[PDB]
Amino acid sequence: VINYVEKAVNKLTLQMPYQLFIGGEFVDAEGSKTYNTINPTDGSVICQVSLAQVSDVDKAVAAAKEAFENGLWGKINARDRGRLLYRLADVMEQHQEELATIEALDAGAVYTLALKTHVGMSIQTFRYFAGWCDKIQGATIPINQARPNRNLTLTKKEPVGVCGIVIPWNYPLMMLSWKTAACLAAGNTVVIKPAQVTPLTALKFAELTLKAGIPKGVVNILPGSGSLVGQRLSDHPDVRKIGFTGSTEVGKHIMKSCALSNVKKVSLELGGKSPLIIFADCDLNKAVQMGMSSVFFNKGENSIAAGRLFVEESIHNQFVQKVVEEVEKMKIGNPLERDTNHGPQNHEAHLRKLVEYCQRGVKEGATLVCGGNQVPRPGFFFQPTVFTDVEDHMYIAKEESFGPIMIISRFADGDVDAVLSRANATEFGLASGVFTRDINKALYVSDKLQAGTVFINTYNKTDVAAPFGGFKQSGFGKDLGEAALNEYLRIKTVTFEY
Amino acid sequence: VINYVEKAVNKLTLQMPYQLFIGGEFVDAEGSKTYNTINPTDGSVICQVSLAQVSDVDKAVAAAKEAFENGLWGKINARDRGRLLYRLADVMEQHQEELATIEALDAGAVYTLALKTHVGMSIQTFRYFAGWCDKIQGATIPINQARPNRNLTLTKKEPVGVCGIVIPWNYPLMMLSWKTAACLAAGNTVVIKPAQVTPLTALKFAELTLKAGIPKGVVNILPGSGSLVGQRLSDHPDVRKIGFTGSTEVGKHIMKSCALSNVKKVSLELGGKSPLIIFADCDLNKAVQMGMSSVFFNKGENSIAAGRLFVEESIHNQFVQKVVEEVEKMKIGNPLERDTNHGPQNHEAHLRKLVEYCQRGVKEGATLVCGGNQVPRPGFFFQPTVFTDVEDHMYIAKEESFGPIMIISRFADGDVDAVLSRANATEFGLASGVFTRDINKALYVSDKLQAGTVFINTYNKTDVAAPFGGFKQSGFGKDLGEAALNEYLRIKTVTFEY
Amino acid sequence: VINYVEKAVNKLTLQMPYQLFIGGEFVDAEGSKTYNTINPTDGSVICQVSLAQVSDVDKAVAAAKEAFENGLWGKINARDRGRLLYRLADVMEQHQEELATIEALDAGAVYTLALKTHVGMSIQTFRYFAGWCDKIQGATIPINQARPNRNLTLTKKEPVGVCGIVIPWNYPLMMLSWKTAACLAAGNTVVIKPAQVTPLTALKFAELTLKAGIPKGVVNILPGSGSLVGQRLSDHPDVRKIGFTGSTEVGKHIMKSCALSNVKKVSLELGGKSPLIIFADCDLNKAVQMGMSSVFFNKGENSIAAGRLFVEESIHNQFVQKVVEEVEKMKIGNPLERDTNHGPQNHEAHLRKLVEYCQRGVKEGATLVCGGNQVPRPGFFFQPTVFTDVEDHMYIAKEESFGPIMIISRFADGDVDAVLSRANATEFGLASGVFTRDINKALYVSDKLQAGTVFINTYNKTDVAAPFGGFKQSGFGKDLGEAALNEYLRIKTVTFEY
Amino acid sequence: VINYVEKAVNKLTLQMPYQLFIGGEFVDAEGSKTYNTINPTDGSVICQVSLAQVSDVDKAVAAAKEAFENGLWGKINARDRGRLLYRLADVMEQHQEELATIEALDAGAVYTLALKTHVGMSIQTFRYFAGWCDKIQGATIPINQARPNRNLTLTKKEPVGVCGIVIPWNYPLMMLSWKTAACLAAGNTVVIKPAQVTPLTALKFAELTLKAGIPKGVVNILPGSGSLVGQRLSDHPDVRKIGFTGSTEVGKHIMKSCALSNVKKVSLELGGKSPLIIFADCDLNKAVQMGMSSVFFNKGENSIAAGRLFVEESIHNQFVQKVVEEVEKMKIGNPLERDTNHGPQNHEAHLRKLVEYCQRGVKEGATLVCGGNQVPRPGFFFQPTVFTDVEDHMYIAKEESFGPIMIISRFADGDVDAVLSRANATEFGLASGVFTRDINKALYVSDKLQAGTVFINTYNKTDVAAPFGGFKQSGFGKDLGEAALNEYLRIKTVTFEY
Numbered sequence A, B, C, D: 001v002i003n004y005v006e007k008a009v010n011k012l013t014l015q016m017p018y019q020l021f022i023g024g025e026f027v028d029a030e031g032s033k034t035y036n037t038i039n040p041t042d043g044s045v046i047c048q049v050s051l052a053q054v055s056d057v058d059k060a061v062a063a064a065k066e067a068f069e070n071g072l073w074g075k076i077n078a079r080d081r082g083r084l085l086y087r088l089a090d091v092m093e094q095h096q097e098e099l100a101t102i103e104a105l106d107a108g109a110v111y112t113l114a115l116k117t118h119v120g121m122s123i124q125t126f127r128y129f130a131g132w133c134d135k136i137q138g139a140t141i142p143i144n145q146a147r148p149n150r151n152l153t154l155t156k157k158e159p160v161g162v163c164g165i166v167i168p169w170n171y172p173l174m175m176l177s178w179k180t181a182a183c184l185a186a187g188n189t190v191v192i193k194p195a196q197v198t199p200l201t202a203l204k205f206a207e208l209t210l211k212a213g214i215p216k217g218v219v220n221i222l223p224g225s226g227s228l229v230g231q232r233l234s235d236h237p238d239v240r241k242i243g244f245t246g247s248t249e250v251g252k253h254i255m256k257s258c259a260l261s262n263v264k265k266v267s268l269e270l271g272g273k274s275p276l277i278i279f280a281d282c283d284l285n286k287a288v289q290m291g292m293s294s295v296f297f298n299k300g301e302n303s304i305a306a307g308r309l310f311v312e313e314s315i316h317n318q319f320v321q322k323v324v325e326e327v328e329k330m331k332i333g334n335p336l337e338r339d340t341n342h343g344p345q346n347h348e349a350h351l352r353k354l355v356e357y358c359q360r361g362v363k364e365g366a367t368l369v370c371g372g373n374q375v376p377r378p379g380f381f382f383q384p385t386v387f388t389d390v391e392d393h394m395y396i397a398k399e400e401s402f403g404p405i406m407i408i409s410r411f412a413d414g415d416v417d418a419v420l421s422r423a424n425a426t427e428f429g430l431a432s433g434v435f436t437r438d439i440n441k442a443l444y445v446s447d448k449l450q451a452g453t454v455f456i457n458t459y460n461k462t463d464v465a466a467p468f469g470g471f472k473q474s475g476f477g478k479d480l481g482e483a484a485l486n487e488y489l490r491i492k493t494v495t496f497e498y
């Protein structure tokens, strides 16, 4: 019998676990410590949640180790592991309205979007990776033969073993799912640390693993702080791999911690300052629509968001006029209301950071065309913002906002290489985009952009089958696609002589 | 016009460059600083070698950056990149005797072995990877369609950019070749730091890249210390990937340095304590030959060396008798002499370390059945060594000797899981082996061994097509095989809407 | 409303469609023609089934064409096609007892086996290939660049289009499923011709595609004769690919008909005379069990059945003795009786062939140890048969029986190459096996056997992920595995200059 | 010593073998039968060439079989097989001027073009496939486990064995090289039948295999007729695969012959009627240059030649004007003159077919804008020809000319599906192209074209790494690229229980 925080909202009765999930059971943290999770629509406390301690991490890791080494997960057919993950996906789909509602409460995710993305994509992620289980294959290799004898060389793909997954707050369930689906399809067991400010969909997901029949200890979830819980995961002698999504600065620290303990494997999905180049020969109205999506999607809490838009001189003013027209039509409001287009930012500290960000933008001399401020209403809403006359030396040209702030520079008519160079002049390299009807420009620009993803005449078009990851200080390794599997597998080479 | 140290030896004339190699030219280090490289056959000084300084590292990195960004290497077809690397392999082949002689002098490599392995496998490496250049391929992916529009998603495999390669001294030319061939085949440029005590074949190799037509700046070589030169490579903001082979402790430090600067990619080939399990049902005579080889190959200076032999009780004593019989037959002496089959250890410090290692084995109660001492002759020769009665708790059961020291334990007849468990009780996981005529035991044991390579009825059987790399604290990433390319490539996802 | 033949049997009420399945509905053939399907347990008529005519083939092909070119199947995401196929597997699972019972009635499949294999593997097949839909990927290739311009080359994996599948009667549903699953997963539409003698599970499967939501016209099923319906499929100008399983001589004719019409693609899964080589050093009791299975599985109605057993002289007589003891324990009976382990042969004409086969065996000088005859009881049962003293020149050493007939020869102790040569002296090359505890012998024999599948210390171990197909006159192309998809895809190369 | 036809021409003394090449020897045909090969520049007899008889085919096949089964080729490492093929490419490169001259004489290949394409791409093909030999890899597959036991399933990629290669006359050396390089790289041995009219580079190539150290019998070359020699190859019981390139009608007969004998594998590269669609928004002067190349390249003797050009209404007349202007500038003449743009047609009967083809185009109502007749001069020259007002029902709109004949239709501005439908209304499907600056048109058109290759803003851009093959009646299977290997390898599945 599981304890729940019951809540009647959105024409449903929510049943929300709030405890640590260790070894297949929900339990209090050491000393029954708890913390509050805050609803960004009104600032209220949703409920209290267990606050994991070092000793709780050790319990979770030991559970994950036991489940891997002796438990059923390490013994079943790859095909049957997939069946379990495809059942987990079905269970998530049967509970999708509920999960989207929890996500709306916990993270401020507009409910209609959370059904399609926060939850919908999480469901696709498990189904997609479930199909990979019995299709992960090694090789047989035509090695030189030790004549007069013979040789056979094969490789085996094996799990890495116990993994730690540490994620941010922008899409709590989806970031969990991206990494967990891959981790599990490869046959690993896991300890997951959601962002402290957003534990709820992770904990409801935990309960769903029980309904799906995922063996005890395969999935362990520890709400709590990075510096305590996350840190211990990265130092742990029995953890063999860390999957991390977050800031560059925490990413550096995680990699260092992987190094100093046991050279556990690490992959890093870090920040972005993604450029979007819009040429005069694009479809203008479409550029306005995708341009807006590139910045404002999920209230800008989107690591691949276009962090700079470069717009060709001859269409720049008209582009800005049209963006403003469209911005005025966005309906800011409660994420649970069906007419809402723009929900609140995820938490208070981040709202304050966006306010400071835009003050500094104005100070340094950029033109504030609209927004820039907290919306006058309860909770942590921020007004969709547009800046123009942004010059390359400005702080807002360099720094990741992670909010709904469109940052626009001009480039001269016909000036392709010059704008590319401005677009690449950053230590980030997560995403990028180009709008043009011209095939030669589109191909050339996409060769030249120094980013892990290039969108052409679209934006935010990720997919569970398309690998996603950065270059430079945006990190390394992929989430999604076949390529994601390689972060969660080891290759054993076996060489016979006969 | 290049400066050489010239030496008539082994029926040829060695012409050995001795300077740093930067931007296609041989140049003195900052301040014309130099150091001595020492011949382990007689302890003599071979010659003076330039000692790279921080500013030399910066020059080398800048030459590599320019070669990659604006030089010809970043412009030619992948096919033509292949041609250049196939030509470099040819040029190495034309100088095979000279290279192997330099290696005998510099590392004490027995000449006949250096020809086949140190040099022969290096030539194979470049030819293998040259063949990969126009066969490195991305994907097209059946992503969900934004109906009524269409989407196309492809990936492009691109180079990482400037890489640094840091390598040890046991196989100077071969370690360099393993990593450099994969690095260059993937379209990168590189700065290489040979182990300070073994710079000579790296510099000769550098000259050979000129003969081959490799554009200036693509290969740069900096003889110098790990703590100055290697450190700066791992710290440099323009270096994007480090390929490292060496000890676990230095590996941790390299990985930490990569994190703290610019989250440059890293791969790590670290130490081993590889177990070899010998069953009573094996071909015993052949087990003695392969068992001796698993320890003594290349005077034990070999990361995959069997650092522990577990011999089934009923054949143990007979196995020992025969090894002792064969050890007595080994000709220890000058690596250039054709009857030599055991050359000197690589350098004085390491010989000392081996004497100390064997003292500790004796002190702790292991039975020294032969060897254990420096051979009383000039240079740094150490006796082929056999320990028996080795207990799991003993130092020599756990620490990597990196020398010709056979370390033998018994296990009970019919035990399989118990010996596996003892063989797995290490934080190393580089290689391993099993001798048995029994198919079921062979397949089962290779499943259970926690190591990146498992040899069955052979040992030391690496191959340029077979991926090579560790689990646990032996590191991560592969050298050799298709898999090695992945350390040297980035994946860019390109998604169109149309 | 669908018309059914209703039947109360096996504690179920069977609802069996009996008409042509065309464009998503059950319809009568041209002129309402029908034929009888016969129950092999007692020779009775199960029911009347529509008898497809030429005009019915054309209607089916037209419905497949329309569903491919204009219907929903041609438009949905690969991922959603996957979902439809997974759902189809679920529906099959919900009907598994009914499908196994229908197969028991129609093909004489022993019910408990049909549940596990005939039906159970069919379900696995659809789930497996459902997983492939969104993981079928093309390439991007590093072609030479037309400088100063650039080139991009990619490949797209596309459906072949309208396919015909023609299958035999030994595993009616499973042979349908193997090929149909791969065909549909690749995005094609299909016209299926079951063996005329075994139409029933195919017709039920057709109804299940409706339950699962497969768009109309994607699956069309045509009970009828090979010489009429099969022939027209292979001749049809709008069919682009034939997938065929059956005899070598019909295979040859199908291939010829593909040629003479529109060079439609073809794959051919033909007969087998598969050798099983049993060495003295094998586990003898397991060799008996697996040897039993290799011949008698599914009443020998199994294309990969061992059609010759080669037993090493020193264990030959002992092996035969043990086999006879085991054969005597087999319960022959009605496939619905839970204690039955040997059911009747599929249909009468095949029983007749088996009788003639053994007459000729005895005529030519082989020693008939047991069986060889129809069991005296109603239906078409055949007594499990063992021949010894079989010589290489004998008809029964050459020709496929496709019935429960063990055909044993000796080979001299210590021989390997001689027995290999005898095992390879056949124009067949479908499967093969070796039992030995010796690793070197097992690897060597598996190299030298000229067969598409080699079993080692097991037999009949097929798997939906393991490719299955023949060499030489056993055909070409694979069913099962990733490799099966290649028969049902085309590759388009797209090369840009920009 | 080998007998040569000796000829002082093009600054060289050509030494041309003229006999059959069987088992590493140049030998006369049965009864010393010969025929004449004709120089198409002046109609003169170059020399007499042996005319292979059936018994000669049988000797070639026996030599290939023996080379495969017991000779060195079947025993050497894959890597060493690669070396021999690289060395063969080196030898071809050292004889490249000589080979190009021979091709100029035998096929009318313009010398400068022959250096770059006929010969140059042949050299690239051998180098490319040489790199594949040690990178052909099988798989290890995570099959369901027969609990309590374990299973290992692996695949081995194996050669098919003795192959027959039958080719046409348009690029005699290159067609040979495309197929043979892939054939040999996969480890097979081969009998090659060159087009009767063009034996000479094939025979010179044979001698080059000797110089390169390709083991006797691996390559056998039999000049002679398709209906005698080609027939017997396709009928032969020891040939296991035919690789065919030629007409659709012969392809059908070849496929039939493979069926009727021993179901040998077959791949088919058949004809083309390839559409090129040129939109008004293309770069027009470039479209004229590439449009001309698309038809006139290699005097139109090019399977992928654009057999119809669809030109958008608003640019049609200007396009035709420019074409005519550029056509008038083409230098027609002796393929040895360095300024020749247009050589003679390959042989007399083909010239006559081209004269008839143009008669018929005028007769049925097409507008002859220029050319259409034999150039009056010695040899077999045909005028570069342009037709306009071509309509979809016309003979010249459906039939492959295989000559320098531009066949132009208009299509209405702003229709796309309508032009596609016209471009797809053929049973051919070898190649196609689209010229447009619009990315959306380019991508959509490339999806919709029913052709194995789509060129975008280029034409004739084949590459040794890019797979090349038809859909529909243009055949199946690929030459070039990784995908070519699959026609020449078999897959053996090996499954263990342990």
Ligand SMILES: NC(=O)c1ccc[n+]([C@@H]2O[C@H](COP(=O)([O-])OP(=O)(O)OC[C@H]3O[C@@H](n4cnc5c(N)ncnc54)[C@H](OP(=O)(O)O)[C@@H]3O)[C@@H](O)[C@H]2O)c1
Binding pocket: B166, B167, B168, B169, B170, B175, B193, B194, B195, B196, B197, B224, B225, B226, B227, B229, B230, B231, B232, B234, B245, B246, B247, B248, B249, B250, B251, B253, B254, B268, B269, B270, B271, B272, B302, B303, B304, B400, B402, B430, B470
């Ligand atoms: N897995 C494999 O493929 C493999 C192969 C060969 C060897 N090994 C391992 O190598 C070890 C023995 O070699 P070793 O004792 O020379 O190893 P090491 O001390 O770790 O040195 C390896 C290389 O790293 C350099 N280095 C030292 N400090 C550095 C720093 N702070 N930053 C960057 N580079 C630095 C060294 O420079 P210096 O020359 O100045 O010392 C040397 O070039 C054994 O454990 C052996 O198993 C592993």
